Amino acid sequence: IIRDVELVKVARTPGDYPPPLKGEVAFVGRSNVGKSSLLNALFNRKIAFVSKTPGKTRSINFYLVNSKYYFVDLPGYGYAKVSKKERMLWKRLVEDYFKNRWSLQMVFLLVDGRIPPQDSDLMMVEWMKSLNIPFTIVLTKMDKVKMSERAKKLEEHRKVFSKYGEYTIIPTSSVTGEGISELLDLISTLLK
């Protein structure tokens, strides 16, 4: 049960992270995948910025939850015409985070449920595997998947992500609430 959510750190440079406390989980995915919307659904409040147009990579944001854990919002990758400077910033921040944040318990990798897994997502998977970073796949935007196509598409994500490694796969919709409570429970378990 999430009681309190506070934005406490906007990290713009490597290593500018708050004290580890009791642990944390992180969220990442392609820009526009629905990360801010998912965070808001999890927090049960509008706090992360939602938009049809993806924001530039600028920071890693730390949300202090119940005064003892963090939900960490990593910047989205790909999509926009990411300039050299922006991708370098992206790489610089996320790599620093992965390599140095020992208290990270789990990364939730958000991917669009509506289409099959894509190359940049698979690259993300390979990278975290190489860094020994645990991760769980979260499918987003499930409310837009035709009921008659849900089975095929879910199997496709399962098949693809099984050729690799993973913690589990949770379909979600920030619109209907599908999977939100299941994701919350898994997080509570990982943290406690």
Ligand SMILES: Nc1nc2c(ncn2[C@@H]2O[C@H](COP(=O)(O)OP(=O)(O)O)[C@@H](O)[C@H]2O)c(=O)[nH]1
């Ligand atoms: N139908 C639907 N739209 C969503 C869902 N999640 C996000 N969106 C929309 O997708 C667009 C991107 O959302 P956003 O949360 O800002 O993505 P972000 O760039 O990953 O943080 C927005 O227009 C959202 O309204 C979802 O579960 N269902």
